[PDB]
Amino acid sequence: NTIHEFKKSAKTTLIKIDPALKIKTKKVNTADQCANRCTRNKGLPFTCKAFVFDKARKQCLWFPFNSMSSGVKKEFGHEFDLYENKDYIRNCIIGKGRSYKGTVSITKSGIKCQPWSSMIPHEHSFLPSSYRGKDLQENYCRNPRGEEGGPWCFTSNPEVRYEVCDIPQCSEV
Amino acid sequence: TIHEFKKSAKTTLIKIDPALKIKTKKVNTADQCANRCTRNKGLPFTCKAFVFDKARKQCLWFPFNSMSSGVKKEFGHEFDLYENKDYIRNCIIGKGRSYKGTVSITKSGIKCQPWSSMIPHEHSFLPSSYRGKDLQENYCRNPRGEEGGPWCFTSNPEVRYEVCDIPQCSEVE
Ligand SMILES: O=S(=O)(O)CCCO
């Protein structure tokens, strides 16, 4: 069971703008079954970069793209959960990491990040809805205002309001 | 938990910068090191890799990996190195000569052939004659800096080799 290995976005599927792009679907029992096929890439005529489980139609949708790909857009649906293969979510930072979408959720000194949706331990105004496009989801390290320090988070230690996270620059020579 | 790490057999790491944090503990198995690393509990840093000393049954947890500036990768028959995939760059610079991620599937979704195997395809891209190239397992690699990026010999007898679909670091904003 490889499902916990994917970055999950609730109530979301992906749509092609490009009719050219390819999709594979199969009726299935559980979301874990979509995950296994994606991880192993068995019987897909492409590299599985993401999949959707449709909980109403009991279907996997396997994709050679993700939510960051050109010619694809997110779509809302109560029945869908999106799972993006972490191997195709850039895990290094460009510049100050304004566009960082990876899942690192621990600070430089090893403190588990506080969820953006929470006011515990720390009250703050980085509400996800105020910061659209900045992916203030779960407790991921993010740099929503593009400050000098790189991605950071509020910390689950009450004595440390916030700390930078230790995410490498993609290229610095 | 151990499968979200890239394993390098017979390898440890040495820190030349003495200010870099380390934590060690005698354990039973490498799986237990992986668990503490993934959960990052009781570690005053971000766990980016660990080594398991099979002789002493000791975990060595690191806030660095083999690509970190000033770390000595060294042979040792009793060590296995495990690098957290979140910290191995999963995108390509230029032609991907330096790609060391764990993607093992071609663009058309075929499982790569192991570099050390000669079935289905016979070749002269042996690990031994490509030191530093990490021609390990069946990972997509670009040892000669060739145009289309990391590639592999394919497990499909009808397709000698094909490029993989590893994104450029410049692909996404
Ligand atoms: O101003 S806050 O303390 O709320 C966050 C600052 C981190 O840049």
Cα B43 to Cα A56, A79, A106, A137, A165, distances in angstroms: 42, 39, 11, 24, 14
Structure tokens at B43: 């570690």
> In DSSP terms, which residues pair with A27 in a beta bridge?
A59
| Residue A169 CB partners (closer than 8 Å, separation 6+) | A92, A93, A94
**Residues B140, B171, A68, CA angle at the centre, nearest 5°?**
100
Fold of the domain built from segment(s) B89-173: Plasminogen Kringle 4 (2.40.20)
Phi-psi region of B99 (alpha: psi -120 to 50; beta: other; left: phi over 0): beta
Instruction: Give the integer Cα–Cα distance in Å for B10 and A40.
Output: 26
Instruction: Give the integer Cα–Cα distance in Å for B28 and B20.
Output: 25
Ligand 1 binding pocket mutation candidate from A162, A163, A165 (most atoms within 8 A of CB)? A162
**Per-domain residue ranges of chain A:** 1-89, 90-173
Classify domain B1-88 at the CATH class level: alpha beta
Please tell me the experimental approach by which this structure was elucidated.
Answer: X-ray
Structure tokens at A119: 């006011």
The answer to whether the beta carbons of residues B32 and B21 sit under 8 Å apart is: no
Instruction: Give the integer Cα–Cα distance in Å for B148 and A171.
Output: 20
CATH code reported for the domain at A1-89: 3.50.4.10
The answer to whether the beta carbons of residues B83 and B65 sit under 8 Å apart is: yes
One-letter amino acid at A25 equals T
Instruction: Quickly count helices (H) and strands (E) in chain A.
Output: 1, 7
The answer to whether the beta carbons of residues B150 and B164 sit under 8 Å apart is: yes
Nearest CA to ligand 1 atom 4: A124
| CATH 2.40.20.10 applies to domain A90-173 | yes
Instruction: Give the integer Cα–Cα distance in Å for A126 and A145.
Output: 10
Residues of B in contact with A104 (CB under 8 A): 46, 86
> Would you call B16 exposed, middle or buried from its count of C-beta atoms within 10 A (0-12, 13-18, 19+)?
exposed
One-letter amino acid at A29 equals N
Q: How far does residue A144's CA lie from ligand 1's centre (Å)?
A: 10
- Sign of the dihedral defined by the CA atoms of residues A50, B166, B156, A1, in that order: negative
